[PDB]
Amino acid sequence: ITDDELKKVHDFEEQCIEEYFREKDDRFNSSNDERIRVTSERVENMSMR
Amino acid sequence: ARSQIFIYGQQWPVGSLEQAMLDALVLDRVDFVKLLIENGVSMHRFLTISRLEELYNTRHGPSNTLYHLVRDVKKREYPKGNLPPDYRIS
Amino acid sequence: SWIERAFYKRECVHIIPSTKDPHRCCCGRLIGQHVWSISKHTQLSPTDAFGTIEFQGGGHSNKAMYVRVSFDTKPDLLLHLMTKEWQLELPKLLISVHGGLQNFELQPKLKQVFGKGLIKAAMTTGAWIFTGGVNTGVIRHVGDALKDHASKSRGKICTIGIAPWGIVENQEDLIGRDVVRPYQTMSNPMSKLTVLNSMHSHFILADNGTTGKYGAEVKLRRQLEKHISLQKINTRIGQGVPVVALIVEGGPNVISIVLEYLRDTPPVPVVVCDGSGRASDILAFGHKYSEEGGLINESLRDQLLVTIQKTFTYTRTQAQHLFIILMECMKKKELITVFRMGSEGHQDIDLAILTALLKGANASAPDQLSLALAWNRVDI
Structure with missing residues (x-):
């Protein structure tokens, strides 16, 4: 491919990498286990406070 | 380091951040690499040939099997044998 | 090729007045570094600084378009540039963020609330954020808010900053x-010039020479x-786009900016x-203690005078x-x-912003x- 097409392909790859990483973060943050753990830690700190 | 050393208005000497970058790289400190990158240090202006050669010749951090690979390819290229202990891997 | 043939630029060809320092001219640049018409005698030429900026370092990599234009250019050409060459649709809302050029630090809760509000307001309405361009003070807070936005959200906030061309670091x-x-x-702390903000989307770096x-x-x-607000919105009911003016800290000049707005x-x-x-x-202390607008009694008038003279270190007549x-x-x-942080001040930036737009x-x-x-x- 040419150079503009190479830039377009590289930008598409960076978009895909960002999409995948932060969607993985959204999946981790919306899971039941992470929610339960965050709630328990907040409830413990809230009980001491 | 994030909450005290990298506070707002902190004066930084020229070239010290790249030295801290090299020291964090040779000691396998991923979060310090992240913090230094987020605090202005760029890999394009930092990474040189000599710095990469120093990174390949470091002795800190975890163990690796790179020396055995270098010894094997040196034995295959020039059939010598065991590398000298004070060998700089080019 | 249209940007060079449509937008113009100006450079310092003067008589080099030393004023105070012999190297520092009326433009401030070095005496041998040369190459309005009053004392600068500047000449007009096609631009040589436009394109895309690849922000190396500072965490996330972000590309921001930029163009150097003259300070006397007609805004219609600039708006045509953003609509056509930069492929930006006409915004449903314009936000003008003004503040102090000096760096400052705010409360953590106030900063978090302001950043989340600015991000959500520019996201939901598809607005344009207008900042000072360089990474100083309130624009630095906006850049931190945009860094948080990139760290936890999937949109692209259009955050066009306008900065002086001669004050940005590494002009070459x-x-x-x-x-x-x-x-x-x-950014070198020894140099008085400041770098551009890393997490901006477009730049209208303007050179008066x-x-x-x-x-x-x-x-x-x-x-x-003004030219953007004159443009009609897509609803075609008989209204232009709404313009709000967000003020954080600020100095003596932002009071004149508020008066002009x-x-x-x-x-x-x-x-x-x-x-x-x-x-x-001081604007908030005026607003709570105001009664019927301009009807301000003597005691809070003297309180406002002494707070102006203390905070801004001004004289009696300046205050x-x-x-x-x-x-x-x-x-x-x-x-x-x-x-107002806490209390009953809508508990949010965006309720205040959109309500102010609705009754403005x-x-x-x-x-x-x-x-x-x-x-x-x-919901609004």
């Missing part, structure tokens, strides 16, 4: 014609905002924030003139919406409904 690094130029986010001095972008930014046809609502300090705090400008601003007390338009409920339909805000 941004020289090119439609060429991607790398930029360094490192001079280097290291401000004032080369205020008139162009105001004219561009309020005493305008059409009027522009102004939203201020409390807890940052300086001019925003009196600033209080006169405050009262001239206050005559229009209905437009100014004051956000001051039109019929069909017009407010069409504005809310354009912003896709059913």
Whole structure:
């Protein structure tokens, strides 16, 4: 491919990498286990406070 | 380091951040690499040939099997044998 | 090739007046470094600095388009540039963020609330954020908010910053014609020049010729905002796009900016924030202690005078003139919406901003409904 097409392909790859990483973060943050753990830690700190 | 050393208005000497970058790289400190990158240090202006050669010749951090690979390819290229202990891997 | 043949630029060909330092000319640049017409004798030429900036370092990698334009260019050409060459649709909302050029630190809760509000307001309505461009103070806070937005959200906030061309660091690094130029986010503390903000989307870096001095972008930014507000919104009910003015901290000049915004046809609502300090705090102290607008009694008048003379370190007559400008601003007390951290100050930036826009338009409920339909805000 040419150079503009190479830039377009590289930008598409960076978009895909960002999409995948932060969607993985959204999946981790919306899971039941992470929610339960965050709630328990907040409830413990809230009980001491 | 994030909450005290990298506070707002902190004066930084020229070239010290790249030295801290090299020291964090040779000691396998991923979060310090992240913090230094987020605090202005760029890999394009930092990474040189000599710095990469120093990174390949470091002795800190975890163990690796790179020396055995270098010894094997040196034995295959020039059939010598065991590398000298004070060998700089080019 | 259209950018070079449409936009122009100016450079310092003067008689080199030393004023104080023999190397420092009227433009401030070095005496041998050379190559308005009053004392600068500047000449006009096609531009040589436009394209794309690749922000190297500073965490996330972000590409920001840029163009160097003259300070006297007509805003229609600039708006055509953003709509056509940069492929930006016409915004449903314009936000003008003003503040102090000096760096400052705010409370953590106030900073988090302000950043989340600015991000959500620019996201839901698809607005344009207008900053000072360089990475100083309030624009630094906006850049931190955009960094958080990139760290936890999937949108692309259009955050066009307008900065003086002569005050940005590494001016030779941004020289090119439609060429991607790398930029360094490192800023030398010894140099008085400041770097551009890393997390901005577009730049309208304006050159009046001079280097290291401000004032080369205020008139162009105001004219561009007026020209944008003159454009009709896509609802076609008979209204232009709404313009708000967010003020954080600020100095003596932002009071004059607020006066220019309020005493305008059409009027522009102004939203201020409390807890940052300086001019925003004196505006808030005026707003709570105001009674019937300009009807301010003597005791709080003297309190305002002494707080102006203490915070801004001004003289007696300067504080009196600033209080006169405050009262001239206050005559229009209905437009100014004051956000207070905690309490019953809408508990959010965006409720205050959108409510201020709704009663700054001051039109019929069909017009407010069409504005809310354009912003896709059913809750508002």
